[PDB]
Amino acid sequence: VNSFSGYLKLTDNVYIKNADIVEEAKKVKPTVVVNAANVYLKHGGGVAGALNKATNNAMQVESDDYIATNGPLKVGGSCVLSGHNLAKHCLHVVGPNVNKGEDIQLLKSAYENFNQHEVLLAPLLSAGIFGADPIHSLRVCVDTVRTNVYLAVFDKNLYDKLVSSFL
Numbered sequence: 001v002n003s004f005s006g007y008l009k010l011t012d013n014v015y016i017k018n019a020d021i022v023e024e025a026k027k028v029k030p031t032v033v034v035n036a037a038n039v040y041l042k043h044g045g046g047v048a049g050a051l052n053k054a055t056n057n058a059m060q061v062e063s064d065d066y067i068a069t070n071g072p073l074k075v076g077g078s079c080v081l082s083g084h085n086l087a088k089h090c091l092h093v094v095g096p097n098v099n100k101g102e103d104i105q106l107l108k109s110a111y112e113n114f115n116q117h118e119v120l121l122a123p124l125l126s127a128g129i130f131g132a133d134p135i136h137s138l139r140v141c142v143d144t145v146r147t148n149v150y151l152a153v154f155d156k157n158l159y160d161k162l163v164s165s166f167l
């Protein structure tokens with residue numbers, strides 16, 4: 001039993017809710033919140049910009065030190081950093097950004113990072129400003145993640161389309 005509330009159960013392990021991931025994290029304080037990161041951990045917009053804003057830019061400060069030490073992530077890769085005031089940890093995961101020409105096949109590799117964590121709060125990878133089809137992202141999530149994932153979908157209209165089209 002966990003404290004996630006109001007989710008629709010899609011499969012044995014995948015759950016979904018119309019919610020602002022920032023407000024969800026603040027309420028649940030999950031062990032792991034997933035950020036829709038880029039390889040430079042520049043948290044400018046989309047989910048990343050919103051999460052970072054909620055940390056008063058502390059996520060960005062920590063991220064800049066991480067990059068200065070380690071260099072950029074790989075597309076499809078991840079790193080674990082602090083969750084600041086939102087969660088114990090933040091798993092920064094880089095899905096392919098279609099608006100940069102990146103290979104959508106890397107979306108499965110991106111979701112594989114979730115399997116290193118027993119429970120996660122997460123957005124759909126590569127959705128929104130990363131330009132992928134969210135119906136496709138949800139399908140890859142369900143077919144790749146085996147751990148317990150609670151998906152927050154900000155757009156109510158999109159949430160209804162994902163549910164009604166889910167196979």
Ligand SMILES: Cc1c[nH]c2ncnc(NC[C@]3(O)CC[C@H](O)CC3)c12
Nearest residue numbers: 020021046047050123127128153154
């Ligand atoms: C940007 C943002 C702020 N807070 C959030 N909380 C959860 N997801 C988010 N973004 C991606 C998406 O969920 C996928 C599909 C739709 O195009 C739009 C919403 C955000």
Ligand SMILES: [Cl-]
Nearest residue numbers: 046047128129
């Ligand atoms: Cl977005």
